[PDB]
Design a protein around this ligand. Sequence first.
Ligand SMILES: O=c1[nH]c2ccc(NCc3ccccn3)cc2[nH]1
Length: 330
Amino acid sequence: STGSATTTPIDSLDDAYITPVQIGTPAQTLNLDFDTGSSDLWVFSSETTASEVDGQTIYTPSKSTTAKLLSGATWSISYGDGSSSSGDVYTDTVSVGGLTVTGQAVESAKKVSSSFTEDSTIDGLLGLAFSTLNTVSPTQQKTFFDNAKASLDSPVFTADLGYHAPGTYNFGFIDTTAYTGSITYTAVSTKQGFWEWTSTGYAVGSGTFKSTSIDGIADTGTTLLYLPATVVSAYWAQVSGAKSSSSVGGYVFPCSATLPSFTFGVGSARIVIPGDYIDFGPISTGSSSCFGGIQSSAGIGINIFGDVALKAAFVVFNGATTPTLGFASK
Ligand SMILES: O=c1[nH]c2ccc(NCc3ccccn3)cc2[nH]1
């Protein structure tokens, strides 16, 4: 089997991407944030504290004839931006772009943190990291991808995120029309539960390529590109007026600037992030200070190839017995 679903930026900055997901019988369609950096499928629901729901579409398990309470199971998760959610668990039928999994753990939110409440466009998350990170207790649950894998034509999914435009998540097949040139595959470590890999280096604009190993994760749930301070300093040094601001929380630059591209290495191959991808707009409405899309990972503890990097590529998440990642230009 296969599935294919369009993913759409939630705003004009591509802060995140939402993908429609059918849950239950009859289908309840929720727009979920497909997150290759986590492993929980959780949704706003009929059980979510009323004051914490503001415009989201909710899953109501009592209206689904295939919903079954997973007795005793609870979940609780916190993300890198400090956001969090928690609740209990149902199993139900979940379909993504025509691909159906029965008995999928659907984690029903009883509580969500303010940043989820304040974002009316995200109805929940669909985790696509490794199931070892799933937070359901006392019985850990599998991701949608893990559950679907045996049924897929090929044990893969692909992320094709758009810049200021819709993109695509495919499951079970590689669309050879969706990229240019060839796909370069690279090794993955699953030891931290992430799609963790090692970039072979970087270039800034038309500068020479610096060969250097950068270990990081392919994380569709993270907006920006977080890289070592040395790398990030070398990038922003090429932007007149750019500076790291403690008060804002990262590198900012004059909105009047033309940003240089950023290249990262995948084996001997190169993925080029156009300068415009690195612009995340005024730090506050009407400001002429703009927030940078490449930021330091110092104090995060890990480098993160977030949407800024991933949307420049066609990315294969290969879930074969030994997982790998593939990157192609597009
Ligand atoms: O690295 C990041 N990923 C993000 C996704 C959405 C956002 N913005 C909206 C949001 C935040 C938290 C919960 C719900 N919606 C910011 C992000 N930063």
